[PDB]
Design a protein around this ligand. Structure first.
Ligand SMILES: [Mg+2]
Ligand SMILES: [Mg+2]
Ligand SMILES: [Mg+2]
Ligand SMILES: [Mg+2]
Lengths: 559, 48
DNA sequence: ATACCTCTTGC
DNA sequence: ATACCTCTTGC
DNA sequence: ATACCTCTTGC
DNA sequence: ATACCTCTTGC
């Protein structure tokens, strides 16, 4: 029935028991420079809460949903894999929402034309630790001398696990607390699994072989980073980090192979208004001057005519490939979009995000179903397979069935397939763009692969750091023991129930550039209205939510 | 033909020949291998 | 005594 | 008197 | 350590 | 007071 004793505070220049060590700031600054450059500084802070780990051990676990895949035709459902599980927790902040609110986004997006990522740093403070002790009256006392541990993997020794890919970054609301996630990482494993269908006879091999001892790697924080111990008075801070990576644009393109170059001169123009009064080239298709890449005909049509190269490309879908560890969907860059979609035509390439209350779902809404959406980029660089086709070289037309392959004809005798599903047109002439950011649920920057050769882009984030990326930040509560402890014993050790709270504050800097009017007509711009109006404000209860928004609004020539 | 394109040296027993030293311009080669496949990239799922 | 099919990675 | 959709490859 | 809804009554 | 799996983007 004691308060513990209240203990007394000694005082240095950067801290003590009853001395704050930090300052809260989650404010965003725009600073206009000469020539239309802007320096955007975004501050962000949060109160973070964290419990002691389940157990102070590292574990090696295997996951096995064999049963589900055992089904036949449920290949895609495979979740098998191995992983190391640590006692540490990770503080990840890589995600649009952590840093900006809508108002901000708006601005950026409407007035700028390109954006560069500059630097970033973070710090922790006002640390606090309390212990629970318990008729179920729970009491809480500060444990003045206990500690919080912190480690920053600046060397990037640990494997990299961006958490946004699972919606586990921090929260997006400055005024409400949040937490870090428990850290874990992939551990190697061999695995086989033969695809099958409903109609498939017997049991296609489906097994977990084990682990290529060659491929083994087991890391630990303890052995690789220096751990800091903070007490309340303590505080920690990373330096400032600078990024090396390309800029990101905020404009989208729209021309496709069809709109490149000099359109054909029309010998004949309409003479009155009306949406049926077309113009006419006025020349026999087989009599026109110009250039093609087709040696046989004399036809020259908007679809035949030569273009300098090729925007976009086509690839297989839905493709699953498989290697040593099981199958996985083959990614695309492009996505699709347009008039012939409307989220329902929604296909391959468009990404889809799913998430919780901490990241956008309405706070007050009950029921644990995740909120979702499919981002549909503005950039018209994807494909409409249905429109594709292939024909015989003789090119005698109108064309015969025997000389043409359609998205309609079935391949391999399977009805619901056609060449477009296994087609691929990437090649030296291909040209395209990087994905666009996705607010607020998009990852912001990402690490590059350590392969000898490399992707030309990643699909999860727009900024890929060329060199090293900022090291991960882990934390964890220091074990607080009871008076009984026998390491020699097999049992798990008992600890005092302990937990901690601390504030975290970060600063992320971008640099961008104002855009300027070039066309006569105005352009698209994000804006509020009666329809969405409520998405941007709390409910009479404090309901909040963050809807997704687009990014590359304005157009730009492609050529 | 060699004859038309290089200079030929004639050595007798007493003779001897030597090339200069040549320096390479090319990437390094690593001696480590990777093992993760698309399946092992990133944050594994949290196990409840 | 090796430099991107000559002389000439010289001068 | 042409520089990456302005002024402005200026200053 | 308060200046006209940011940074910044700073520099 | 984060640099490309150590010390060490130090010296
Ligand atoms: Mg260091
Ligand atoms: Mg190092
Ligand atoms: Mg082996
Ligand atoms: Mg292997």
């Amino acid at each position: 029935g004691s308060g513990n004793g209240s203990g007394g505070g000694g005082g240095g220049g950067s801290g003590g028991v009853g001395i704050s060590t930090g300052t809260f700031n989650n404010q965003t600054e725009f600073k206009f420079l000469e020539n239309g450059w802007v320096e955007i500084t975004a501050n962000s802070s949060r109160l973070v809460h964290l419990n002691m780990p389940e157990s102070e051990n590292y574990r090696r676990v295997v996951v096995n949903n064999m049963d589900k895949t055992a089904v036949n035709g449920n290949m895609a459902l495979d979740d098998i894999h191995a992983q190391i599980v640590t006692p540490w927790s990770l503080v990840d902040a890589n995600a649009w929402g952590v840093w900006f609110n809508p108002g901000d986004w708006q601005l950026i997006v409407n007035t700028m034309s390109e954006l560069h990522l500059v630097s970033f740093e973070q710090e922790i403070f006002n640390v606090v630790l309390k212990t629970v002790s318990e008729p179920p009256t729970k009491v809480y006392n500060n444990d003045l001398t206990a500690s919080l541990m912190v480690a920053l993997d600046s060397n990037n020794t640990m494997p990299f696990t961006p958490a946004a890919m699972r919606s586990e970054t921090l929260g997006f609301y400055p005024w409400k607390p949040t937490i870090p996630t428990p850290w874990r990482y992939y551990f190697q494993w061999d695995r086989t699994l033969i695809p099958s269908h409903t109609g498939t006879s017997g049991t296609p091999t489906n097994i977990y072989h084990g682990t290529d001892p060659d491929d083994v790697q087991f890391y630990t924080i303890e052995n690789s980073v220096p751990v800091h111990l903070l007490r309340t008075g303590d505080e920690f801070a990373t330096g400032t980090f600078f990024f090396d990576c390309k800029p990101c644009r905020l404009t989208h393109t729209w021309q496709t192979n069809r709109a490149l170059g000099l359109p054909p001169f029309l010998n004949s123009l309409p003479q009155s208004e009306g949406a049926t009064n077309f113009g006419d080239i006025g020349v026999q298709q087989d009599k026109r001057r110009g250039v093609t890449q087709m040696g046989n005909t004399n036809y020259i049509t908007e679809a035949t005519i030569m273009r300098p190269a090729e925007v976009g490309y086509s690839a297989p879908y839905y493709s699953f490939e498989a290697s040593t560890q099981g199958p996985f969907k083959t990614p695309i860059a492009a996505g699709r979009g347009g008039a012939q979609t409307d989220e329902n035509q929604a296909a391959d390439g468009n990404p889809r995000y799913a998430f919780g209350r901490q990241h956008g779902q309405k706070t007050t809404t009950t029921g644990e179903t995740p909120e979702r959406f499919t981002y549909i980029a503005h950039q018209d660089t994807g494909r409409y397979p249905e429109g594709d086709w292939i024909q015989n070289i003789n090119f005698n037309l109108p064309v015969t069935n025997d000389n043409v392959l359609l998205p309609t004809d079935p391949i391999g005798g399977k009805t619901g397939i056609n060449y477009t599903n296994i087609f691929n047109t990437y090649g030296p002439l291909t040209a395209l763009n990087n994905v666009p950011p996705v607010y607020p649920n998009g990852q912001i920057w990402d690490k590059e692969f350590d392969t000898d050769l490399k992707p030309r882009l990643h699909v999860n984030a727009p900024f890929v750091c060329q060199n090293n990326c900022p090291g991960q930040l882990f934390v964890k509560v220091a074990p607080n023991l009871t008076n009984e402890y026998d390491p020699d014993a097999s049992a798990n050790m008992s600890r005092i129930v302990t937990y901690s709270d601390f504030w975290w504050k970060g600063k992320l800097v971008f640099k961008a550039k104002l855009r300027a009017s070039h066309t006569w007509n105005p352009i698209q711009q994000m804006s509020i209205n009666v329809d969405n109006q409520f998405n941007y404000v709390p409910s009479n209860i404090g309901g909040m939510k963050i809807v997704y928004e687009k990014s590359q609004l304005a157009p730009r020539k492609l050529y």
